[PDB]
Amino acid sequence: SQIRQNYSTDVEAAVNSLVNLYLQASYTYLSLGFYFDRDDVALEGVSHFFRELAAAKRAGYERLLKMQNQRGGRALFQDIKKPAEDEWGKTPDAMKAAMALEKKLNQALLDLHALGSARTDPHLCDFLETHFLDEEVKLIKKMGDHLTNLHRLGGPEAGLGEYLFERLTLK
Amino acid sequence: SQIRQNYSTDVEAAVNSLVNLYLQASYTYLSLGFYFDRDDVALEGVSHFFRELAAAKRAGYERLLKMQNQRGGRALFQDIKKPAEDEWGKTPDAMKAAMALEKKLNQALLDLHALGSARTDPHLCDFLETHFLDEEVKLIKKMGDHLTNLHRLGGPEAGLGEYLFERLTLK
Amino acid sequence: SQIRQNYSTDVEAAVNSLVNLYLQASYTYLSLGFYFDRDDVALEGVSHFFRELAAAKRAGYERLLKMQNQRGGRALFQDIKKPAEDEWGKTPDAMKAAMALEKKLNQALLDLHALGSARTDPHLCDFLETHFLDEEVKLIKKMGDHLTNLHRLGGPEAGLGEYLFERLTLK
Amino acid sequence: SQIRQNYSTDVEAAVNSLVNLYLQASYTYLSLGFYFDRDDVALEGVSHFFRELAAAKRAGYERLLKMQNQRGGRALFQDIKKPAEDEWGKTPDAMKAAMALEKKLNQALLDLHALGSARTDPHLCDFLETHFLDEEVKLIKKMGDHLTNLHRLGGPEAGLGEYLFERLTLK
Ligand SMILES: [Fe+3]
Ligand SMILES: [Fe+3]
Ligand SMILES: [Fe+3]
Ligand SMILES: [Fe+3]
Ligand SMILES: [Fe+3]
Ligand SMILES: [Fe+3]
Ligand SMILES: [Fe+3]
Ligand SMILES: [Fe+3]
Numbered sequence A, B, C, D: 001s002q003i004r005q006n007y008s009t010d011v012e013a014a015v016n017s018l019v020n021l022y023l024q025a026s027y028t029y030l031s032l033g034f035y036f037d038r039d040d041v042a043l044e045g046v047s048h049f050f051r052e053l054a055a056a057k058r059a060g061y062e063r064l065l066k067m068q069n070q071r072g073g074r075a076l077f078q079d080i081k082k083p084a085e086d087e088w089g090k091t092p093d094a095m096k097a098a099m100a101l102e103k104k105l106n107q108a109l110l111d112l113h114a115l116g117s118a119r120t121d122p123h124l125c126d127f128l129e130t131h132f133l134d135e136e137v138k139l140i141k142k143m144g145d146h147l148t149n150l151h152r153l154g155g156p157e158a159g160l161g162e163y164l165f166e167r168l169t170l171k
């Protein structure tokens, strides 16, 4: 590559790997999105929440692909694994799955930062610092807040809580 | 008729028949509308919902009458049967009646499409495809969503649920 | 399902199947998009062309998923197969791959129309007629036009042709 | 210095050194700029391209000088070495020289980041991360793209290619 400079084969491959992780996460959010739109689930605000995350994850992998090209890396794509579940339960269940997915993505981001730090690749580090790490932190905080409000609305009268949360918190 | 072309006597009569079905459905929604406006029912958003459907069904039969005239058919009107009930219960009860009415109208629409398909009348088919079939599908989906939200708000604390639904879902 | 009416299990499954085909096609266009953005390919207009198709295919599968929910179907997702190639050659090569992909999607659409026609499901038929069939036809015509212009610009001085086409035809 | 804090003598001197490298690079781009404006070269778009880089490099050294003052460093200036060539050849030749210059500047930037990292000077690191590293990466990618398009337009009919590139790619 005529442009490649300070860009290790390890980062390149880990970038390709993080791309597939974002594709898979996007896919997961697509599935949660349509799930909450089913006539027998029917929580429009929950559906919108997960649809937006699909979109947000797609921006993530598009930005990783662009950075790959900018550094002189070559994108390689693998199969995208189907989401882990077909039916996602109630809002708390789905929100817990989403939290778990975001934590996995955040760990992959931190591992990639550690890697690029180890290959003294400050561009790669900064790129993640600027476009990824704070967004995960904000999003995780938000999902925690949601879980706290669902838990407070939970238990005995869970059905009413789920309705109120979708109406009064989600948009 | 100087304009009539490819327009079978069967379609013509089935169109007249579907007209009476829309008139009757409009009538049913009129009754549900005023029902939820009674001082002892007093669910303004439910009332508005059913009033709008009366209006929507009237547009339906007006469009069938116009198409009848355009194809060279002759409108014939029968008595409009009074609605099946005088008192409509709670929101879930009424919403179930509405669902059942929409399913009946949808089946009549599908039967008329089958008929016009059998008389190779593609205008009649397309007319239904364009002005009726998707609207039934959207409306049925919406009524399902509503039923799911009422069910979730149901049971022990049904009175509160009925209030919240009318306030936070219906407009 | 409380809303499902005239919606066969076969259509439902074929809809799920067409969804995976759109996901895979979207994926293919993603790959072609970044391919033409590589510093050693560097055909920005070709890149934009394929990026737009990724987006267009995503709208396709989102509309199929929405229709699935509207009819009372249940979405089921499988693994998304990686694109058939890692390197896509020159503009004519990639444009031929795209043509071949669009023809496959069009055949799947026509097969699904045949199926829904056979289950007398006029909603499903019309939905495809309105949101899919004409768009494939226009797009295929466009890809043919492109292939004709690349062929005319081809052979001995292929490198110059590829440059001019990207600059003067693609946007 | 009454303001100096965490600012090593090594960084200070390496900053002065990077300044002279930017001055020299600016000078190189000045020379390429006027070169392509000669009546016997006459490639206005190539001239503009290199003139802009002169300007961009000047912003670079001005920002390094400002940072020097902000940290309590003292600017020291040396002679600015004349550009390596008097005549710059064809667009591909000049674009290769520019690529080689940008790679040298990028390596100097990376070496200075390594240095400030080694003196645990996170301000210096971030400053480079924010104002320099991504700009080099974007610019190098752009110069690669250009080289790919010139190469595609190259060889037998190089004169025509050079004309088209200047007219249809450069602004
Ligand atoms: Fe939102
Ligand atoms: Fe399951
Ligand atoms: Fe708020
Ligand atoms: Fe929002
Ligand atoms: Fe929004
Ligand atoms: Fe309304
Ligand atoms: Fe009664
Ligand atoms: Fe149509």
Ligand SMILES: [Fe+3]
Binding pocket: B125, C125
């Ligand atoms: Fe048709």
Ligand SMILES: [Fe+3]
Binding pocket: A044
């Ligand atoms: Fe709403």
Ligand SMILES: [Fe+3]
Binding pocket: B171
């Ligand atoms: Fe309204």
Ligand SMILES: [Fe+3]
Binding pocket: B171
């Ligand atoms: Fe209204």
Ligand SMILES: [Fe+3]
Binding pocket: C048, C049, C052, C171
């Ligand atoms: Fe376009």
Ligand SMILES: [Fe+3]
Binding pocket: C085, C086, C087
């Ligand atoms: Fe390959």
Ligand SMILES: [Fe+3]
Binding pocket: B126, B129, C126, C129
């Ligand atoms: Fe049609």
Ligand SMILES: [Fe+3]
Binding pocket: none
């Ligand atoms: Fe044109």
Ligand SMILES: [Fe+3]
Binding pocket: C171
């Ligand atoms: Fe466009």
Ligand SMILES: [Fe+3]
Binding pocket: C171
């Ligand atoms: Fe565009």
Ligand SMILES: [Fe+3]
Binding pocket: D048, D049, D052, D171
């Ligand atoms: Fe410029």
Ligand SMILES: [Fe+3]
Binding pocket: D085, D086, D087
């Ligand atoms: Fe010379």
Ligand SMILES: [Fe+3]
Binding pocket: C044
């Ligand atoms: Fe451009």
Ligand SMILES: [Fe+3]
Binding pocket: D171
């Ligand atoms: Fe400009």
Ligand SMILES: [Fe+3]
Binding pocket: D171
């Ligand atoms: Fe300019």
Ligand SMILES: [O]
Binding pocket: A048, A052, A171
């Ligand atoms: O939103």
